DNA sequence: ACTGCTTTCGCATGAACCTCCCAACTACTTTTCCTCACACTTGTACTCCA
């Protein structure tokens, strides 16, 4: 609950370095094809979101998977 | 004097206790595991007042 699945991933990418050995590349195209069909919206929002993504993004691709072995906070 | 008062004795073989523990199911602890949002600063935003 409430990022307990997420904070362990943050503790997992940090303790064992999934970063800098593997590819921490979240294929966001394979994620939002679901979210179109979850609530049955027209497929323009698949690309309407994409340019909102590609406007506000450091390094256009690759929403970064995060690593944390730093502390428990 | 004499009673009561004893004392051995028996047709032959076959055979014919009790308290505490371990019960049964209740309840009220143990044995260390994981999972984090909380205190003061500080840096960065968009105001300020001289």
Burial label for A46, CB within 10 Å (0-12, 13-18, 19+), is middle
Phi, psi values for residue A61, rounded to 5°: -80, 180
Q: What is the resolution of this structure in A?
A: 3.5
| Token output for A16 | 């064992």
Tell me, in Å, how far CA of A56 is from C1' of B49? 37
* Measured distance CA(A44)–CA(A16) in Å, rounded: 39
Q: Which nucleotide is nearest to A73 (CA to C1')?
A: B36
Q: List C-alpha distances in Å: A69 to A7, A19, A36, A51.
A: 11, 12, 35, 33
Rounded Cα–Cα distance for residues A18 and A34 (Å) = 26
Q: How far apart are CA A2 and CA A8, in angstroms?
A: 11
The CA R_g of chain A, rounded to the nearest whole Å, is: 15
A7 with A72: CB under 8 angstroms?
A: no
Technique used by the depositors: cryo-EM
In chain B, which nucleotides are within 7 Å of a protein Cβ? 35-38
Chain CA centroid to CA A67, Å: 12
Reading the block at residue A40, the tokens are 């049955």
């Amino acid at each position: 609950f409430n990022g307990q699945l997420y904070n362990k991933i943050a503790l997992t990418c940090g303790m064992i370095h999934f970063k800098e050995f593997f590819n921490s590349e979240i294929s966001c195209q394979g994620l939002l094809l679901k979210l179109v069909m979850q609530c049955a919206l027209p497929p323009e929002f698949y690309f309407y979101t994409k340019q909102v993504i590609e406007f506000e993004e450091t390094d256009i691709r690759n929403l970064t998977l995060w690593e944390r072995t730093d502390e428990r906070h």
